[PDB]
Amino acid sequence: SVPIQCTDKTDKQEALFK
Amino acid sequence: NTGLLESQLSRHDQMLSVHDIRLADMDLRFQVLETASYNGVLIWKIRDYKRRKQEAVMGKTLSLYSQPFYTGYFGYKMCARVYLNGDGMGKGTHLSLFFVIMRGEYDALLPWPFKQKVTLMLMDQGSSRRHLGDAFKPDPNSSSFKKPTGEMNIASGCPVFVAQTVLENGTYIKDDTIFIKVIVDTSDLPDP
Secondary structure, eight states: OOOBOOTTSSOOOEEEOO | OHHHHHHHHHHHHHHHHHHHHHHHHHHHHHHHHHHOOSSSEEEEEEEOHHHHHHHHHTTSOSEEEOOOEESSTTSOEEEEEEETTOOGGGTTTEEEEEEEEEOOTTTTTSOSSOOOOEEEEEOOOSSSOOOEEEEEOOOTTSTTSSOOSSSBOOOEEEEEEEEHHHHHTTTTOBTTEEEEEEEEOOSSSOOO
16 A cells, blocks of 8 residues: 556656546 | 738638647547546546557556546546566566656645555456455555656556466456456545
């Protein structure tokens, strides 16, 4: 129970999805 | 002058373009709105798994982030971020599921750092309903749970949530689509 950050906090390859 | 007719025609086309953008944006507002939730629970529906997974491998799109969901009509704004093909210690082997604290219009009134219990999980569309899930407790010292600065802080959760082997060789995927669920504990914060 300890959140691991996210490495890709550097690359902007993301798509909106609702 | 015919040149004046064109000046006006050009103006209308530009306007028509604005209207097109404008219209399309509202379409997104509608979606966000139509898919919102205000009890701290989010059920995210991801369609076109096969495709999206391929786009994750080829690197067209490494992650997808859900629509925002809230702990209350006027509380924390949050959402989920997934990497169909993994991030960190899961890139290529797992599916990584992260939680995301977004900048909310009422952050000046909410506690910080964010400390609500978060349960991440993938639904089992099978008949036994064996949902895969984990539950962490925000890391006070982590920059992912401190009062927002930009639109959304750095996602944080489980880089090794589910093994791509498990997922794809099970009933989590049906009709080329999986459902992700997040549950924020609203148990503590506010209320007179």
